[PDB]
Ligand SMILES: Nc1ncnc2c1ncn2[C@@H]1O[C@H](COP(=O)(O)OP(=O)(O)OP(=O)(O)O)[C@@H](O)[C@H]1O
């Protein structure tokens with residue numbers, strides 16, 4: 001979690017965050033693979049989150065610094 | 071026309087000069103419009119052919135708006151009102167590099183390319199666009215063939231393998247090329263559900279090829295453009311690699327793993343029957359990176375080989391086995407593709423035929439996946455008379471039910487009129503009349519055997535078990551002919567009845583009727599293993615060793631047997647028949663012309679002696695074969711007469727035949743033998759009757775097409 005947010009709210013995204021335990025659980029549960037790891041989730045962390053919520057936010061109607069978790 | 075991608079910038083470049091409302095479109099304008107921001111999402115920054123060719127745009131990012139803010143301001147309508155042919159040439163001037171670097175339309179490079187004169191800092195210190203120096207240089211770096219169409223995604227040529235040999239059928243889908251599919255919509259969904267499954271996205275399609283496993287992928291590809299594709303799966307599209315490998319020529323296939331990784335799982339991959347050790351092993355390091363949704367497929371065969379080793383690459387893979395589709399499946403696609411392939415061939419068809427096609431097709435298909443074979447037979451039916459139509463004589467561009475089924479499908483084997491007249495019910499109702507034609511007298515065997523298989527027919531056969539019979543009498547009584555008649559009547563095939571010797575193939579023939587492999591495992595397998603339709607002749611069963619009678623009861627019971635590979639294969643299409651001659655003794659009762667239940671008890675007693683009641687109680691009907699009346703004797707005449715005329719009067723000479731009971735008693739009397747029946751007389755007639763003519767043939771005193779009885 002820490003890596004992306006510290007890339008962006010710092011400069012780019014000005015971003016305040018929210019976490020459902022869903023993701024909190026999902027990413028841990030689902031996102032982490034036993035064998036192949038969260039290694040894909042590391043990419044997925046983009047996808048279902050960064051890719052997802054930026055896409056949520058990139059409209060801006062959910063404003064800057066706003067957040068919507070799945 | 072300009073490339074959309076180019077024009078996307080171009081109008082945005084017209085939009086560019088519009089935002090500051092520039093007075094004129096002039097060389098250094100789009101230098102801002104080429105770039106949203108320094109991101110390679112704006113290639114003209116870094117991924118541009120210039121930063122790699124000559125002029126890096128990093129700090130050179132600085133100057134672009136510096137001009138477009140220092141343009142003299144204008145008002146809205148004169149903004150983007152002019153090409154200003156100084157710039158307006160770039161419209162045409164972009165078509166210059168499409169020559170030397172071989173392109174057709176005007177692309178992002180080209181719109182860029184034309185600009186290479188004044189679009190710039192052109193000064194003593196010139197931060198500018200080299201003319202041929204950056205692009206023809208790096209327009210190979212970029213791409214190496216850029217040109218496709220105005221349509222399409224970024225023209226940065228990130229992945230050459232994906233652009234080369236990776237086929238997107240969703241393109242073809244919105245291009246309308248592929249034929250929509252049906253009825254795997256379960257598998258479609260489920261495999262897509264597998265795909266939609268976050269845990270195992272990768273399916274394994276299992277099954278024998280030709281079944282539509284990528285026809286699955288067809289509608290799947292369609293569901294991509296049909297947009298039923300799940301949110302997880304939305305952004306992805308179809309790639310399917312049909313592997314043509316033709317220094318390692320494969321690593322291309324490995325290099326593309328980045329090109330999709332470029333797209334960042336913006337597609338799916340589907341590989342069909344090629345799943346094997348690749349170089350080295352196929353695939354995974356991109357998938358094994360945790361990434362890369364792919365549609366996997368195979369026969370159990372390729373499933374039996376390498377993916378058996380790991381199994382944790384199948385950790386991505388739910389194995390889904392397709393089954394040969396149902397009738398409506400065939401029907402519905404036919405329903406969809408009847409008009410297709412009749413318009414493909416420019417003809418018409420009866421849907422009456424269309425459904426009827428699948429009927430016998432599904433029935434007598436020895437091999438394939440029916441719709442193919444159907445569509446084959448269909449196209450066969452289609453093209454066949456269409457070729458008959460287009461070539462003079464043709465009158466019917468529509469095509470009938472019957473011949474389009476039978477005569478066409480008669481090119482599997484034949485016998486259309488029998489393939490015709492049967493409703494699959496018509497057998498039984500008409501059988502014991504039909505059976506009355508072949509095996510003489512024997513109204514017992516007529517009723518009993520047939521009525522018992524009328525129970526194994528009528529739909530009253532168990533999902534697994536055939537009818538079961540153990541018969542006494544002459545071997546040569548028409549016994550085998552009965553089951554040949556059966557084979558002939560029931561399956562319309564003489565091959566159905568198969569010699570299987572219980573007597574001599576007996577004890578360790580349990581290894582030689584099949585063997586867990588330590589090539590048929592043994593006799594009984596590819597007899598049926600090829601052809602589930604069969605008729606079983608089990609020779610003098612009580613002379614077999616009991617070693618097999620268990621798995622023979624396992625034939626009796628459940629109608630299926632574990633094979634050498636272990637497969638338990640359906641014999642219930644057949645009718646299990648057992649043979650015993652021991653009642654030839656008990657024909658003493660028939661010598662006394664008893665009702666044989668006199669000894670059939672003793673017969674039953676005799677057979678109940680040696681075997682499991684299970685093994686015993688399976689028999690539907692045991693039929694003693696009755697004493698031959700003169701009729702029963704001399705109706706065997708026309709049998710001979712038939713197999714006489716079958717050649718002379720039919721398949722060679724066209725020579726007529728006549729006899730008299732005079733000569734026939736001069737035959738049958740001698741011609742009949744007690745224990746072997748008239749089986750002697752057959753190989754008797756072979757000369758003194760036959761060769762009497764083979765004499766007279768070249769003796770020729772009387773000639774062909776005649777007949778003279780003796
Ligand atoms: N349900 C269907 N609807 C439309 N066309 C179909 C359907 N099923 C099969 N086809 C046709 O079958 C042809 C290809 O079949 P397909 O390759 O999918 O069989 P297959 O079992 O996948 O062979 P393989 O296993 O090697 O991929 C195409 O012409 C396609 O239009």
Ligand SMILES: Nc1ncnc2c1ncn2[C@@H]1O[C@H](COP(=O)(O)OP(=O)(O)OP(=O)(O)O)[C@@H](O)[C@H]1O
Pocket residue numbers: 508509510511512544545546547548549550551552702706709710747748749752
């Ligand atoms: N009632 C009958 N019905 C049919 N065929 C009969 C009849 N009586 C005698 N036959 C003769 O039986 C011949 C074939 O007999 P069939 O094959 O049924 O016994 P078979 O078991 O094969 O002989 P075998 O096993 O001893 O070599 C036919 O060619 C036919 O002429």
